[PDB]
Amino acid sequence: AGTSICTSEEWQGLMQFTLPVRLCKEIELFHFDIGPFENMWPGIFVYMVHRSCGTSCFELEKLCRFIMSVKKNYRRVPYHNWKHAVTVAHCMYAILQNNHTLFTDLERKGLLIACLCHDLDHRGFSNSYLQKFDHPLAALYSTSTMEQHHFSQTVSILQLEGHNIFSTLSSSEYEQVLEIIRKAIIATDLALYFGNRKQLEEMYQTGSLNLNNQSHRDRVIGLMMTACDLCSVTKLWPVTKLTANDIYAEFWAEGDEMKKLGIQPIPMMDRDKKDEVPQGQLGFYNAVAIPCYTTLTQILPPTEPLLKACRDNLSQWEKVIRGEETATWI
Ligand SMILES: OCc1ccc2c(c1)OCCO2
Ligand code: NI
Ligand code: NI
């Protein structure tokens, strides 16, 4: 109930934080895994913002309050949590650094912030669940239900005293950046990904894709958001596999609630159907992840390492299906 706010100790601590020198080099790479460095995650975000947008893009105090308050409004759920927020932001940083001048200063700061915020106050339940059981949120937001809520949470945090990192923008640039963030967060609704990707593949293959056309830009940015949101599938296999365990803990908890409401879940959400998981992953990679990174690589050639890693992980799920897995730790 209400919007949570960080403590003075929390944001002052982030302000004083210094990143270890060895990580500077690592943070630039797509395959970088934030996993082993939990205490450093908010500092890693400050560092990314500073490298991409400059140390004077945001007032430091407001930025540190914003970040630690964003952390506090992520819930202690197995997957859609603070750790996922930072992984997705780190992916966008790597895409931006590799394609820096294609995007405006306004886009870069808006997109890094949109990624950190894009799953804010997630409860561990899908849009499917919310709409099936008529949660109050599905009443307010008929489509892209959680994603409209995530944007609303983003705006609530900007409105806390001393948290508005965008105040110093011109009134016109302020409206523009909030629209960038809104569109980017809405785009993380995978329901919209399928149409967006299909349209982009068409525009690319006919050569009509034009980044000077606002509706095209919006679409490319949309696909960036998908690519960052799904980026666990572009890490090294052990990291990808561990994250999948977290995703499924959420799914299985949702399916458990459905059974309580008299309805059997989709197999993916049924903890009594774990044998079906590897085939389900194969279907997910073939239908979503591979086409996403394939199209993104056509449009932004330097994102190619995301696609190569995704392909390597598809191969590992194929090994699992064939019974060729080796020892795994949980
Ligand atoms: O982050 C990778 C990822 C996101 C969503 C998924 C997923 C993996 O696998 C099963 C369906 O949903
Ligand atoms: Ni989401
Ligand atoms: Ni997400």
Question: How would the blueprint of this fold be written?
Answer:
Elements: H1 8-15, H2 21-27, H3 41-53, H4 60-72, H5 82-98, H6 105-117, H7 127-132, H8 136-140, H9 145-158, H10 171-187, H11 190-206, H12 214-229, H13 237-260, H14 277-299, H15 304-321
Helix pairs in contact: 1-4, 3-5, 3-6, 5-6, 5-12, 6-10, 9-10, 10-12, 11-12, 11-14, 12-14, 14-15
PDB class: hydrolase/hydrolase inhibitor
Keywords: fragment screening, hydrolase, HYDROLASE-HYDROLASE INHIBITOR complex
Assembly: monomeric
- The percent range for strand residues is under 5%
- CATH architectural category: Orthogonal Bundle
Per the CATH scheme, the topology name is: Catalytic domain of cyclic nucleotide phosphodiesterase 4b2b
Which small compounds were modeled alongside the protein? 2,3-dihydro-1,4-benzodioxin-6-ylmethanol, nickel (II) ion
Tell me about the biggest sheet?
none
Order of helices and strands: HHHHHHHHHHHHHHH
| CA-CA gap between termini | 34 Å
How many beta strands in the DSSP annotation?
0
Work out the helicity level.
55-70%
Radius of gyration: 20 Å
Count of DSSP helices?
Answer: 15
At the first level of CATH, what is the class?
Mainly Alpha
Question: Structural class of the helix and strand makeup?
Answer: mainly alpha
